[PDB]
Amino acid sequence: GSEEEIAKALEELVASLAELKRATLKLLVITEELKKNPSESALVSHNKAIVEHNAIIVENNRIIAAVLELIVRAVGMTDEILLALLELKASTARLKVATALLRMITEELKKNPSEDALVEHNRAIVNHNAIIVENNRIIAAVLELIVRALNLTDEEVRKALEELKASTAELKRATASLRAITEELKKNPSEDALVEHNRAIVEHNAIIVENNRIIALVLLLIVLAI
Amino acid sequence: GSEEEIAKALEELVASLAELKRATLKLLVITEELKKNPSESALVSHNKAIVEHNAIIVENNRIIAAVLELIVRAVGMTDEILLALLELKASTARLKVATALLRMITEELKKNPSEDALVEHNRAIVNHNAIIVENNRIIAAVLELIVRALNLTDEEVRKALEELKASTAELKRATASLRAITEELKKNPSEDALVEHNRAIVEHNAIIVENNRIIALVLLLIVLAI
Amino acid sequence: GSEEEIAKALEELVASLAELKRATLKLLVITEELKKNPSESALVSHNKAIVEHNAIIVENNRIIAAVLELIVRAVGMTDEILLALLELKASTARLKVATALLRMITEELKKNPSEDALVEHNRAIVNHNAIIVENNRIIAAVLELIVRALNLTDEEVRKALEELKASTAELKRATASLRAITEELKKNPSEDALVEHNRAIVEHNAIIVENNRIIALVLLLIVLAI
Amino acid sequence: GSEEEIAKALEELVASLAELKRATLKLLVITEELKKNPSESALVSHNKAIVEHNAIIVENNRIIAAVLELIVRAVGMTDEILLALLELKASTARLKVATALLRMITEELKKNPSEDALVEHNRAIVNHNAIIVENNRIIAAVLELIVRALNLTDEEVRKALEELKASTAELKRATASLRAITEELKKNPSEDALVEHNRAIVEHNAIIVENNRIIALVLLLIVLAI
Amino acid sequence: GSEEEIAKALEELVASLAELKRATLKLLVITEELKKNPSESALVSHNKAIVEHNAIIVENNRIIAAVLELIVRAVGMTDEILLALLELKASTARLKVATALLRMITEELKKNPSEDALVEHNRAIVNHNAIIVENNRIIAAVLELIVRALNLTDEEVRKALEELKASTAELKRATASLRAITEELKKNPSEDALVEHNRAIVEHNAIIVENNRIIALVLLLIVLAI
Amino acid sequence: GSEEEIAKALEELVASLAELKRATLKLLVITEELKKNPSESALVSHNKAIVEHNAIIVENNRIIAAVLELIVRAVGMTDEILLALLELKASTARLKVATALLRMITEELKKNPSEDALVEHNRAIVNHNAIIVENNRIIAAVLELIVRALNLTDEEVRKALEELKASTAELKRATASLRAITEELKKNPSEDALVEHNRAIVEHNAIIVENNRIIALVLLLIVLAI
Amino acid sequence: GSEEEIAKALEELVASLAELKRATLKLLVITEELKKNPSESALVSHNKAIVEHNAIIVENNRIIAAVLELIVRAVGMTDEILLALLELKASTARLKVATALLRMITEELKKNPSEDALVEHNRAIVNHNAIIVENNRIIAAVLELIVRALNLTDEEVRKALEELKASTAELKRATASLRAITEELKKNPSEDALVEHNRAIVEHNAIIVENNRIIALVLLLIVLAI
């Protein structure tokens, strides 16, 4: 795209980041309220709020993928870039699918809530997040390839990629930990467990938001360096 | 006011009536959903929907009081009209107060829901409706006075007033019936009772909406007859 | 307004006239279908179609009043013009009120239809039309005053005013005739009467549409002569 | 506008000219058919075809006015140009009004044809054409001013302006002649006269089409010279 | 564009070149027939054939400009390239305008032919050709810039550019010669002159076709070298 | 644009200049307070105030670029002007990008402040300013071209351009000096250095504000001279 | 506009005239104080007071232009009136521009005062005044046209226009004289010259105030005569 398109889309990206931050703060609020005064309708409303937070994350990742396609068309594709963009477009579609899946089981839970339904819903949230994580790993791989293809020497870019690789390994570890406690919950579901689990989910989402911040710093540094 | 003001306000009134009808249909839907698949979070969400429906009714009654004030200033006050308008303005303020009361105990229920809280909330809904009923009786008394003061001979107006008086006596009977089953619920609260009770509430609200329709026909006939 | 505004508004007027003609043809169709195969749901749907046709007529009269206000501001007010425009604005508001009244009793009929309700609805249609007639008389009086104030000597204009005065006296006679058969129906209501009556209504509406055509010719001739 | 807009609009102009020529040929055909086998339905259909031909001329003049506004914004306004463009915009609106007037009396004739209605319709066609003529005189005055403002020395332009001034004086004379035979017809209406008159109308329209051709040559020469 | 678009468009270009060659051969035929048996209707038909040949050249130049825009978007704009492409787009629009001008004066000649009209038409053909020449000079300048911007070392490209620069200077000389004999004809118009002149026109068009062949060799060599 | 648009936009420009001056005074205040009582939270708040001051500068440069686009469309583009405006539009987008980058690392510093983060933030402020400088150099080159294209002989304009060229060379020198001390700080970071550095930043911003004042004097003189 | 709008705006005009008179008296005071005790800070403060006086004059001329637009819309435009109002709107925008220019060089003088800066400031005041003069000449030409268009025979109006033409020619002569002494000062700048010059400026402003008084008498007479 043109510099006007790229710049406009980065303004939309930073707007989406501000909205994502605000939603993360709100989710932390309702997580505290649930911790202090846990109840069945509180659990249902908290889960629905988590679903809307995830939908904001998905829109953030869509805008990032759009910006990257404009950036790569600016610089030019390469073999490894083209294979990573085909992987990115696949993961984007898989995410839209899992987003619809999550929203539909959310509506089932809202209509007919029960503890078993909360367990199933939490496990489906953990699978949706694992798909977001894979989307972020592919986006990070694309940015790694774009920087290596440019041969960009900016120490600000190298520093931001060291941050992005650290955030990616941290996000893998947090994803594994969340799948582990999810398998615990599935074995021993209880309201106290549902609360501890939703807490760990909110920590995982916070780590994903940090990942999206680092990704946005890499995009901004690249767009300045080209 | 001028004929433009009255006509504009009647456009706002008919818009509010269409909105009220739409909300009544929606409320009947969720009442059926609650009847078929009753649950605690369904009860909480149903009660919150009743609160938003009542807020729409209150705005309808506010617009009616505004129209009547413009109509009476058009025709001129009289002793009994002025005394009924002072009674109307008092009842309007009492309704704004009870509306805030209901919204605040609604937020308490949403935050900390339980069966006892649902009973208390249903009793406060029944008191809010009883205040709406008194508001409608005073508005009907005002229209009765305006027509008798004009000495208006239109048989369409007399017919609509016979409808309005029948609807008013019906609304007294329905209010008494709802207070009776409310005193039963308070004595013997149960989920099955909470469901049967919310059903009776929705029937009472439907009768109030019929009353507001007849009231709007009387206002339209009066504004045409002057 | 400016010549661009007036011309645009006359394009809107001629568009509304084409729509009105199309609706009149459609209404004649359903009148024939009702005559051939009369039934209760056919009666209800015919009345609802008459209500939508009347709403189109009312929008036509609104556009005519707008155009006349722009024309008079173009030429300049005069004592009799200003008094007639205040009479026109009053009749416009009264018409918006009666339009809402009719739509609301239409919804009552649709929801709770019966032969008595059809009679009451037909009488309310006849009153709505009588208000349309008064709106047309005031609009014709305004155009008579505008032409006399300009002192316009065009024989095409004089001819169109002879047509407009003939159409106005014809419309008074037709209105009286329709009120007469309405008083018959109210005395002796029957399905055969409801059919004959709805036929006479549709004839009356056709005469109103002829009046609106002549009115539009007068506006076009005036706007060309200034 | 940009050179792409001007070129596109001149392609639209030449397309409209080809369509206008085709319509003129068709109109000459039906004029001959009417001359050979004159009849009432032939007269009505011939007049309706004249109305559609005039609508094509009006669209041609709208496109010419658009092109001139883009051309003048290209060169820059001047006092006499701006006053002539305000005269052009007024004449454009007056023409849209008379076009709607003509179409509506056309529909009246088609619906209720008679010899008197044919006379009135032919006279209204002659007035519509006289308005087209005034539109063309203003467009020619604008082009005269644009060329004199540029101080353009091209002998091809001077030749085309000598053609345009000759065509304009010819069009004044032909318009006067057509108004003269129209006043004859109005005095002595007969089918033989209606036929001879429609023939003279079609000759007048042909002269207007020649005027529009010369106007388009002037626009093309100007757009090449800037 | 993509390699599929570029290749398809070059297939369209070579198709247009074959069509242009065929048309040039046909035009030489009718030029000989006119030389052997010159006559007024032969002159008119020959001129119309020249107009259709020029229209084919114009379509060829449109396709060349399209291909160049796809090629430059492939390589990237540069200051001098962007300024030459804006000059090219201007010349393209000027050519579409002059093409319409020529077609319209062609139709005037066909309808009302005379020796004076043939002289004027031949002079307008010579001006149209001079515009084609300027279009070709700009296209050649664009290709010169594209090759210099790539820094392309292919001796086949350098050879084709030496041919293109020689053809361009030859085309300037031939254009000047044709304007000289055109000024003679305008001074001393005669049928023998019209024939000798149309012969010189056909020679000039043949030189333009040679220019378009060399241009196409440069485009093909560039598209292979990138 | 019209004289109203240009004048309104220059009123917005002078309003932005007054706001920029006020912000510069405020920044000098807090710079002194930091010098007298330096502390980590004082450093963080000072840096955030510098970021808001830079955002005001960026809005000032956007309004200047808007005015220049209206001015050039008033006079007409030229080759060197169009190339400089494309350079300006690119630099405008690059500035919006770097502005978002700065705001995001500002939020990172505010959330997780430390001395290392202050060093990195100061280096990013110096890069943002260097981009503002490049924006101002391009704007000055554009104004130089507009004046030379008009061939404007006003001695007031020549004087203001000698001021603008002196301010531009001064701004280059100050930018280089600030990058030099930034490389010192990066080598030897300390609180005392951070303070001395923020002082030099504020001096650099003051020089940019002088540049924007001279630019506005040139725009005002040009708009009067056209 | 309506009689209320015109009258209100004339109340604003007479208020602005009273304020202008008061400011002229104050400026004469400080002019005398400067003459008696001339000094650099006295010169700076006197010049700033002259700038605020000129800003009051500019607001006076804005209100006058507003009133004239309401008056002409009351009576109706004409060709020469419309061209003079376009000239007035242009001069109004040019004045707002020169007003901003003056205020900004005023702030430059206040911040960095010197004898050279005082000379430059006085020359810019003289240019600002020359623009005020042109604004007043255009306003007087508009009033001359409005009166001639009305064909107003009132001897009070003719007398006031003879006064207005005399004041206008006097203002031209005074403007030329002030430009002459300005060219002296620029040639031979000295504190004694700066003082003598500021004296001549204050005399010129007094003559402008007399012009605005006569203009207001003409507006009042016209508004009474319409």
Next chain:
Amino acid sequence: GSEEEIAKALEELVASLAELKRATLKLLVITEELKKNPSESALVSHNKAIVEHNAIIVENNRIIAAVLELIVRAVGMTDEILLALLELKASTARLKVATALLRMITEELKKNPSEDALVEHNRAIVNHNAIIVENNRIIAAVLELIVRALNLTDEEVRKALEELKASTAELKRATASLRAITEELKKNPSEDALVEHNRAIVEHNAIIVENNRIIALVLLLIVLAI
């Protein structure tokens, strides 16, 4: 308005009447002093006192017009009343305009007094009074209509209206006489004439004060009768 508003405004009216009486006595004093010891500065100061007396009359008429607007809104408008109130509001604005005109030529006289200026000032006073007279005639017509609309049978009101009509005819005669001697003065201006004229002015003002007294008695009787 309310009875409190009407009563308060009538208290303001009676206060203004007392002030008007006091001012009339003072003006008679200075008229006598001028008669005994006539001189140019006595003439100037007397005229300025007449201007302040006229300003008091204008404020009296404003308060009366306010009271009438409250009274008519109390009773209700009618066709002739509404047309007279529009005439009253117009005359009120025209009077505010002529009041400003008089005050401004008063300031011109005070600043630059001379015998010619005194004559011109006296003629402008006589025109100002003629506008006051027309204001009073319109106010009397409004009161005549208000009383006739009420159909008020009070003999006190009929008597006061016979007084008001006599005062009105007397005021017409006195106005004509004053215009006659004003036309004498304009023909034969002299100090002895200026004195005799100011005397006749003071007699006219006394008649206006009698008119305002009768008008206020009629308002008081009406407000008691409603």
